[PDB]
């Protein structure tokens, strides 16, 4: 995330994700709901059935937010300032859930990009997700 080498890897890896960011975000959400049933409690207003238009729509948003972050590795706190208010202040999301979603995103990237998901890239992406999660739980700073 923060080391020059890590930023380079993150931007590179995300160029390979491309316009699939939204699709992967939606699949990562389904993996999280299935794998870790505790998380479902934050979405009482969603239809959580596979292929849900709500989950699809929400995955796209999550995907666009990450693509935004990758463009602003220099100033994550500023670029995601609004999102930290929502997650930590309004929703009070338990920080453990960010680790769970991050694991599910890495799993989804492994599934779709097996050749590009090298150990070096896996490492840099884990740091990236960890650094985003920090920002989004920043109200707990």
């Amino acid at each position: 995330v923060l080391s020059a080498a890590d930023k380079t890897n993150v931007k590179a890896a995300w160029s390979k994700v491309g316009g699939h960011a939204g699709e992967y975000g939606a699949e990562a959400l389904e993996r999280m709901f299935l794998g870790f049933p505790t998380t479902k409690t934050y979405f009482p207003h969603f239809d959580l059935s596979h292929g849900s238009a709500q989950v699809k729509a929400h995955g796209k948003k999550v995907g666009d937010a990450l693509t935004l972050a990758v463009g602003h590795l220099d100033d994550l706190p500023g670029a995601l300032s609004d999102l930290s208010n929502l997650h930590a202040h309004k929703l009070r999301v338990d920080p453990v859930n960010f680790k769970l979603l991050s694991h599910c995103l890495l799993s989804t990237l492994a599934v779709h990009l097996p050749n590009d998901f090298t150990p070096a890239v896996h490492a840099s992406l884990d740091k990236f997700l960890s650094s985003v999660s920090t920002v989004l739980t920043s109200k707990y700073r």
Binding site: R31, L34, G35, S107, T108, P114, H122
Partner: protein
């Protein structure tokens, strides 16, 4: 821990396809790179030790109704001999899941992953047994 008959069969069927050497080597290798403090406990021997880890996981997958007994000895090994904090058992487990996802692609469906997360949690908890 507790799986249905259908989940258990999917879990077992995927394990028939797991090369313990190649999966083991890769899972241990990624642990060392992604979580660099584990380098305190550990190249051609990453492969050799990776293989032993996976062979042990395999034993869990075939003894799902008694994980505690299966890993009793290994639990003492990691606690009093090596002093490995049990949080790292959960980390290795998730790395193994990412590796299986990479190897199996679209066959590693959201449902199958959810089953493997149960198994990995069961295994990590059995290894933590004689700590806490």
């Amino acid at each position: 821990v507790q799986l249905s008959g259908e989940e258990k069969a999917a879990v077992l069927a995927l394990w028939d396809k797991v090369n313990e050497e190649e999966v083991g080597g890769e899972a241990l290798g990624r642990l060392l790179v992604v979580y660099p403090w584990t380098q305190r406990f550990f190249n051609p021997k990453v492969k050799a030790h990776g293989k032993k880890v996976l062979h042990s996981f395999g034993e869990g997958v075939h003894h799902l109704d008694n994980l505690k007994g299966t890993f009793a000895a290994l639990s003492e090994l990691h606690c009093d001999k090596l002093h490995v904090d049990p949080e790292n058992f959960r980390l290795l487990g998730n790395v193994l899941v990412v590796v299986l996802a990479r190897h199996f692609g679209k066959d590693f469906t959201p449902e199958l992953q959810a089953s493997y997360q149960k198994v990995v949690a069961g295994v990590a908890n059995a290894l933590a047994h004689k700590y806490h």
